[PDB]
RNA sequence: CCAGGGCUACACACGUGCUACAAUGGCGCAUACAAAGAGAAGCGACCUCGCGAGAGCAAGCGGACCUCAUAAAGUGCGUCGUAGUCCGGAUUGGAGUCUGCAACUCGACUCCAUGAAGUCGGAAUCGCUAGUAAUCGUGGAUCAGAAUGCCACGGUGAAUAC
């Protein structure tokens, strides 16, 4: 039981477990089963030793974990330095989407700031 | 977005103006209120300044400004900060 | 020591073509690898002492030797005498079996793997690098662990300078970049 | 070295998903498992496709032809 | 009179709401049951593609005829078995669709990746006496687009008043 340079849970199901994987879904991950061809309601232990080598040619083409969290990192830093509306937005702190910010900011804010 | 059968939407005077800059080869700031045109290839290189409401602000098109429009380099309020 | 006779038969006569030594003896070699932990918390108590030694002798099969503080400081509240680290010495034919594990099994199971720096090597052959996790090597359970620990390495030689340490652990097939 | 002290250590062989079955000395007691041999892992081709900068104008044409 | 900008700003303060903190629940699958409404530059069957919002070709109706239109909670079966979880959905990354000269400021919606706070809330305070409260859907007006708001409708359906 260990997918994709994680670990993946032992006791969790075969659909479930997997989205431990940080780019994947619950959709995304049967599409990784019923390409290999189990069933989706077994675990991730008591999966058979010819079954968790293939599993990973189908995790292979998926941009995961270390492959994905670079690009997000690229793609937010280069909004930074162009100078674009969305990259001031990430440098300070206030949200990107077009939502109000006079009142219930306080995800990208953080919680309350008292004045001193 | 502007949706892809459509295509992309720009002006029909600052895509003259634009090809009229490359074809005369100027680097003089061209000043255009079409914050709504998306950028094309041919602007990369030029000092665009587009306005804001108050003034005419330059840009100069790097690459990373293709599928972009211009008014995300011409701020429109300002702010300091509250205390 | 498997990589010991990989050393002997043909790393030797490489580095003797692309150096021009005039002496079998001027060849560079490994003198130790050396795994420090650093666990400054064992100051609260003695428990988190006793299975960061456990963790190191498990990877490493010898006994951990405990440090002690040199002087008495107060930025990190400490006095002169408390233990506060750890290590292991190794040489000669369990040197390479740490080595041949470390460049084949534990250093590619690094989460988000991407390669080692090569302007670290202290102007004098020695190369030190340091890892983030535990959990890396094929020892420690990943679920039997309880706390996060880390440490380092230290592969002390017998390279005169920066560069000569360089070329000799790349004909070792190093994972640089 | 001293006969008490130390950990056990013993030869094991390793079995990896790059079909190796490898043999190192270690103190693990049982046998072990495999992701990644040090021939396998993309470190010499994979760092190289993985950065994929790509091209602007080619995110531009793509989409449509004038 | 015109173009762009602003009415959408944010150290922050109060009022009214929607969604939650789960098992009287989440998901998947089968399956029963309404009322009131609008419709011509309008609503838009089926067929054909599309992961989907949609697109294509294009009948039907100025309407108890036709379409909008599939009620949902429920019931049958199955699973997950008390974790910040197969709970919660914010928030951001890459793709889209659509209406619209025109979606950067500053629209709704789709698909995929990310998966915050939140485990029932101090003092204080509000609504409600029966088809009420509670609950779960559904329509409409303003309107190119844009309802957790406003107005209207049925399904389930209490506790208690010395
Ligand atoms: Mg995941
Ligand atoms: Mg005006
Ligand atoms: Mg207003
Ligand atoms: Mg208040
Ligand atoms: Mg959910
Ligand atoms: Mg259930
Ligand atoms: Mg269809
Ligand atoms: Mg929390
Ligand atoms: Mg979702
Ligand atoms: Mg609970
Ligand atoms: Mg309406
Ligand atoms: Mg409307
Ligand atoms: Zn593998």
Do not use: C, W, Y
């Given at each position: 039981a260990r997918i994709a340079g994680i670990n993946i849970p032992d006791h969790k199901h075969a659909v479930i477990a997997?989205?431990?994987?940080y780019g994947v879904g619950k959709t995304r991950s049967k599409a990784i089963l019923a390409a290999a061809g189990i069933a989706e309601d077994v675990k991730i232990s008591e999966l058979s030793e010819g079954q968790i080598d293939t599993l990973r040619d189908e995790v292979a083409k998926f941009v995961v974990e270390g492959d994905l969290r670079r690009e997000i990192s690229m793609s937010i830093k280069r909004l930074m330095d162009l100078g674009c509306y969305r990259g001031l937005r990430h440098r300070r702190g206030l949200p990107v989407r077009?939502?109000?910010?006079?009142?219930?900011?306080?995800?990208?804010?953080?919680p309350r700031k008292p004045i001193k | 977005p502007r949706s892809l059968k459509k295509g992309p939407f720009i002006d029909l005077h600052l895509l003259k103006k634009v090809e009229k800059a490359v074809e005369s080869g100027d680097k003089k700031p061209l000043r255009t209120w079409s914050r709504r045109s998306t950028i094309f290839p041919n602007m990369i290189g030029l000092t665009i300044a587009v306005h804001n409401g108050r003034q005419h602000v330059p840009v100069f098109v790097?690459?990373?400004?293709?599928?972009?429009?211009?008014?995300?380099?011409?701020?429109?309020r300002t702010y300091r900060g509250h205390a | 020591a498997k990589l010991h006779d990989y050393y002997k038969d043909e790393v030797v006569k490489k580095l003797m073509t692309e150096f021009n030594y005039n002496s079998v003896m001027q060849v560079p070699r490994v003198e130790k690898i050396t795994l420090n932990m650093?666990?400054?918390?064992?100051?609260?108590?003695?428990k988190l002492l006793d299975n960061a030694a456990a963790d190191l002798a498990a990877i490493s099969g010898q006994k951990p030797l405990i440090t002690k503080a040199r002087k008495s400081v107060a930025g990190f509240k400490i006095r002169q005498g408390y233990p506060i680290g750890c290590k292991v010495t190794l040489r000669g034919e369990r040197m390479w079996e740490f080595f041949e594990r470390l460049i084949t099994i534990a250093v590619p199971r690094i989460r988000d793997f991407r390669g080692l720096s090569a302007k670290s090597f202290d102007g004098r052959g020695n190369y030190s690098m340091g890892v983030?996790?535990?959990?890396?090597?094929?020892?420690?359970?990943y679920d039997k662990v309880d706390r996060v620990r880390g440490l380092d390495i230290t592969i002390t030689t017998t390279a005169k300078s920066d560069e000569e340490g360089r070329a000799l652990l790349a004909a070792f097939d190093f994972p640089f970049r | 070295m001293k006969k008490d002290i130390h950990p056990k250590y013993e030869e094991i062989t390793a079995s990896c998903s790059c079909g190796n079955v490898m043999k190192i000395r270690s103190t693990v007691g049982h046998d072990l498992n495999l992701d990644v041999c040090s021939k396998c892992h993309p470190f010499f081709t994979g760092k190289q496709r993985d950065?994929?900068?790509?091209?602007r104008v080619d995110r531009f044409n793509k989409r449509f032809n004038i």
């Open positions: 997997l989205t431990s994987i077009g939502q109000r910010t006079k009142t219930n900011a306080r995800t990208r804010k953080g | 790097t690459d990373e400004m293709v599928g972009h429009k211009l008014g995300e380099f011409a701020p429109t | 650093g666990v400054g918390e064992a100051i609260a108590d003695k983030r996790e535990q959990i890396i090597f094929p020892e420690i359970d | 950065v994929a900068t790509g091209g």
